[PDB]
Design a protein around this ligand. Sequence first.
Ligand SMILES: Nc1ncnc2c1ncn2[C@@H]1O[C@H](CSCC[C@H](N)C(=O)O)[C@@H](O)[C@H]1O
Ligand SMILES: [Cl-]
Ligand SMILES: [Cl-]
Ligand SMILES: [Mg+2]
Ligand code: NA
Ligand code: NA
Ligand SMILES: [Zn+2]
Ligand SMILES: [Zn+2]
Lengths: 287, 122
Amino acid sequence: ASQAWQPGVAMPNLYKMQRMLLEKCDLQNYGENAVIPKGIMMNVAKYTQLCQYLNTLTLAVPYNMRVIHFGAGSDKGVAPGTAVLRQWLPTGTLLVDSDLNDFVSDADSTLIGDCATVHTANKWDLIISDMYDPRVTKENDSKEGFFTYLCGFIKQKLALGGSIAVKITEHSWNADLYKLMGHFSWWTAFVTNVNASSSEAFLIGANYLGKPKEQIDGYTMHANYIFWRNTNPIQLSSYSLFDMSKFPLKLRGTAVMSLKENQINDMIYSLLEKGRLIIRENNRVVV
Amino acid sequence: NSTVLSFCAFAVDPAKAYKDYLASGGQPITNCVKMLCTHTGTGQAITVTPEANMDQESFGGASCCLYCRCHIDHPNPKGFCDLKGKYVQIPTTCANDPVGFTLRNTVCTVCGMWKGYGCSCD
Ligand SMILES: Nc1ncnc2c1ncn2[C@@H]1O[C@H](CSCC[C@H](N)C(=O)O)[C@@H](O)[C@H]1O
Ligand SMILES: [Cl-]
Ligand SMILES: [Cl-]
Ligand SMILES: [Mg+2]
Ligand code: NA
Ligand code: NA
Ligand SMILES: [Zn+2]
Ligand SMILES: [Zn+2]
């Protein structure tokens, strides 16, 4: 299949435009995965397909890129996702990761503890989150916890032009996060081909604008997401994992400028929208 | 990793402890992070990105380091680790025990390959 070759499947605009009622999801998140190649961890495969998908988007890639990775630790005590990010990102990109529990990492810095304790003055070019809480005994409402911190972190600490990829599932999601997706030049819900039988997806926001481009209702969009997953079964595929020749993120040398609010006009928003500009300071990073 | 890590962490000589543990029939440390790669790399031992050739696997460095995995001091002069933040290439025949491989082997200082494996020097 043509779809089988892709690193995964993005939620079609047709489904984003709906106003669906919230239903239960007909998918299970755990299963014996027949597509993961031998000796490869699910999360290496998953993050590899995520990065392959991010390669198709207009990500800003400054010369001195700043990337922060939340929920980077596993119960294995290692950081498979971080290792993939380090493989993907330009050499000497600042990569900081974080998790509630202790783990060993290939990141430049590793912060242990609840994400809410993570403080930094500096802004970031890319935010990746794999945060998830097993914890849904009754209703499926918008979840707070780390999502509340994440929305604040994006609003305060993501550079204009920056991008995000945040893991969600049927039950692990947040209405304000979805709303915030409308503050990006483009957004989608992306399902990796290696984990396609799960309700997991990454909410990807490309090129942050710091203001609404469209009005997203979070409860409605999650219902739209569930409806799409319920009505479009995706067969597991690891096809994309067998050609790694073009994997690393392209070195774009994206301009970084510190501009005042009043300097950010029409032509600047246009550059931001096209993945051609990052707006933030270039001070020393302290996390 | 279930016993092996503590066993070595609470030994006077953690590397010797791992060897003894293996000699007694214990399973090598698991969950070393194997990368997806082209297998058309330089074949050097420790690199900035995955550089496996056709005879090697590439692993995330920190996950293949005994001292990182046991959360103990490195024996290096200060506290520096040669593996963490980098990728280590390991002969496919030896890929079952990446931590053991790095403990038992040494990188040639001229060609940058593993002595007794990829290194062909005089
Ligand atoms: N409130 C919170 N703060 C920080 N980390 C959290 C959190 N809630 C969940 N997490 C983390 O989210 C992770 C889900 S598993 C993440 C897998 C990891 N990305 C990998 O590559 O293997 C767990 O490690 C858990 O510690
Ligand atoms: Cl790619
Ligand atoms: Cl330009
Ligand atoms: Mg565009
Ligand atoms: Na970007
Ligand atoms: Na509503
Ligand atoms: Zn180490
Ligand atoms: Zn040599």
